[PDB]
A paper describes a structure:
Filoviruses encode a viral protein termed VP35 which is important for nucleocapsid assembly, replication and transcription and also plays a critical role in host immunosuppression. VP35 binds to and likely masks viral dsRNA from host factors, which leads to suppression of RNA silencing, inhibition of phosphorylation/activation of interferon regulatory factor 3 (IRF-3) and antagonism of the type I IFN response. Here we present the crystal structure of the dsRNA-binding domain (RBD) of Marburg virus VP35, alone and in complex with dsRNA. The structures and accompanying dsRNA-binding analysis performed by dot-blot assays and isothermal titration calorimetry reveal that MARV VP35 RBD coats the sugar-phosphate backbone along the length of dsRNA in addition to capping at the terminus, suggesting an alternate mechanism of dsRNA masking for immunosuppression.
MARV VP35 RBD was crystallized in space group C2221 with one molecule of the VP35 RBD in the asymmetric unit. Interpretable electron density was observed for residues 208–329 of the RBD. Like the VP35 RBDs of EBOV and RESTV, the RBD of MARV VP35 contains α-helical and β-sheet subdomains connected by a short loop. The β-sheet subdomain is formed by a three-stranded mixed β-sheet and an α-helix, and features the conserved, central basic patch critical to dsRNA binding, that contains residues R271, R294, K298, R301, K311, R325 and K328. The α-helical subdomain contains a four-helix bundle followed by a short fifth helix and features the conserved first basic patch containing residues K211, K237 and K241. The RBD of MARV VP35 is 43% and 41% identical in sequence to those of EBOV and RESTV, respectively, and the crystal structures align with a root mean square deviation (r.m.s.d.) of 1.07 Å and 0.92 Å, to EBOV and RESTV respectively. The location and in general, the contents of both the central and first basic patches are conserved among the structures. The residue F228 is located in a hydrophobic pocket that bridges the α-helical subdomain to the β-sheet subdomain.
Numbering used by the authors: 208 to 329
Amino acid sequence: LSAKDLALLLFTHLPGNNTPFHILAQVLSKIAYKSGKSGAFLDAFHQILSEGENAQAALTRLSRTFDAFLGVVPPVIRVKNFQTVPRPCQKSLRAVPPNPTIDKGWVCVYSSEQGETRALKI
């Protein structure tokens, strides 16, 4: 199971499009894949869904409990400017904190052409 297909599977459970949870799904999928745990992550996700939690909460829950994600720093994503960041993510942009980690709600860091930065908070 590729990071791409894992992310797509997660997408099938998420409301809307291009939301911070879609970004989170992509970020987590890549980390899970590289850790040799794409399967275990998907199974853990499915378990949480089966307990009545929907995907947004399941993903934030996994981001703070699943071992592959603990203490991992968010990826930097390059953009021309912050206008490039999808509309449904704009209101979740923040100044970058001292030590952002995924398990504390910091999904990614957007970096503009000039090295101005914003973190995506969930």
